[PDB]
Symmetry: D2
Subunit: 150 residues, 4 copies
């Protein structure tokens, strides 16, 4: 239940561990970033793997009565063969399920995985408990905080 | 003209200053990132502006003496109307100008601009001298370094 | 047992967790830093606890096969009663034990502890395996590093 | 009037520029840190210069009627000959005046200086306007901040 704080430095350390596992870079046609969470990790992977072909898939949700379903705003074409598909984390994997099904032949990776989402991805770096909230660095700032005493 | 070190935290400060200028978010259809340098700034803008429609333009460029050859590897469709197109930095403004020919109605922004490129972008945050190399945080690591005195 | 990289931000998170345990600040007369490793954690504790009385103990230690020779370069007076004495890390606990002989009534704390040293300190925040080297942020820099694939 | 945010990384970059100017390290007997602001910078200098003799001077203030005066809580002995005395910043230099007078033969340096304090120190790294508040990294945390839009 204590939030897990992810600094930019640490995110890049984890992403570089993933990149090393994705060598040799020549096996890949490109990277598909899951917007928005995957954008930064994609940037790091593309740099480390020397990959210039980077595209995106953009999904959002909408409610109708008591239900909630996913909408595709934009997608890279194809079934993902030869691609890495990257998101920042998988939690329960609702979006990851949709993404898997659009790109069934991609290698689908995240930085973080919680237990209920873990089966949906092909690789990930860091295990996080289901009840832990992951605070990513694009959601944070270096900000004054009062001292613990006085 | 010692290199200018850009940490992740400072890059985000600069990008947030750009995002504030781009408010209200409702003026924009989406963001196009210039891969690869624009991917991280695009993620930051997309978070700050609440924009899930993020796409890419991927180009390879090679200098042959006084002329650049441009190869488009992948490009987002359309003329850019209603889009922000973001790259990390402009030096000569050559890439910006090429991208702007592809997307002549986009609002083209960077984080850093050297003097030659400043007039060739719609907005930028930080002035950098022409002969200063900018070292971006996706090209760096936190690494041991020997003491200045042994 | 790959080295464990400690960024400045993460060091401060850990030190704040230590500072919370040391509340209320009124229980303490002051802080003694073990130079040099304890200087940065001491600054953090002094800020968090509102303690302006900060002193140092400076020792040089050289291993000669199986025995250490200790030279006190400078030491804060007294037996440590009412003081926190802070060092960055404990490995064997040899330094801690020596310092504690000098200040037997101090409350001796570190940020990191390897298993051998854990019982030889009053409090610590982070467990580190015995054969893991901790790389502290005062020994590191943000530095260019080549891509994993060229 | 916009606060000047100092990240840990940037503080160390500035402190290393100062350390380079303080070479050769052999000219110094040791470092005196001005508590509390000087503790972190002292830690960095001591590492970079290979200096193990680090002591402190600790001053506080007290009011009496409409006046305000300084109190010495603890001080290193001597007139500072052969020492570096370091504080994080000089602003108006009230404390710096007292420190100068206690250690008239030290080399008194800071990282930051505002114009009214600048004449009191022997060297500093970064000029800061009088009306700018410097936010040091021991006063900050990496913390959630709401997005600029929505
Ligand atoms: N990291 C880095 N890349 C640069 C710098 N100057 C130019 N570049 C790269 O060189 C390309 C050419 O920039 P242009 O001259 O077209 O503005 C850009 O994609 C840019 O990423 C620099 O100072 N630092
Ligand atoms: N940076 C770093 N210093 C260490 C490590 N292990 C031991 N040291 C240094 O070696 C000294 C001996 O530690 P001890 O064995 O006395 O606990 C300590 O001052 C400590 O700073 C490590 O993993 N990282």
């Amino acid at each position: 239940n204590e939030k897990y704080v992810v600094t930019w430095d640490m995110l890049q350390i984890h992403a570089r561990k993933l990149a090393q596992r994705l060598l040799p870079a020549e096996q890949w046609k490109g990277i598909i970033a899951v917007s928005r969470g995957g954008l930064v990790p994609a940037g790091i992977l593309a740099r480390e793997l020397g990959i210039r072909y980077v595209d995106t898939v953009c999904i959002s949700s909408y409610d109708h009565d008591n239900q909630r379903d996913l909408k595709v705003l934009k997608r890279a074409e194809g079934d993902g063969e030869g691609f890495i598909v990257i998101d920042d984390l998988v939690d329960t994997g609702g979006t990851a399920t949709a993404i898997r099904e659009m790109y069934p032949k991609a290698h689908f990776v995240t930085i973080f995985a919680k237990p209920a989402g873990r089966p949906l991805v092909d690789d990930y770096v860091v295990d996080i408990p289901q009840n832990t909230w992951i605070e990513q660095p694009w959601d944070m700032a270096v900000t004054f905080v009062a001292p613990l005493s006085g």
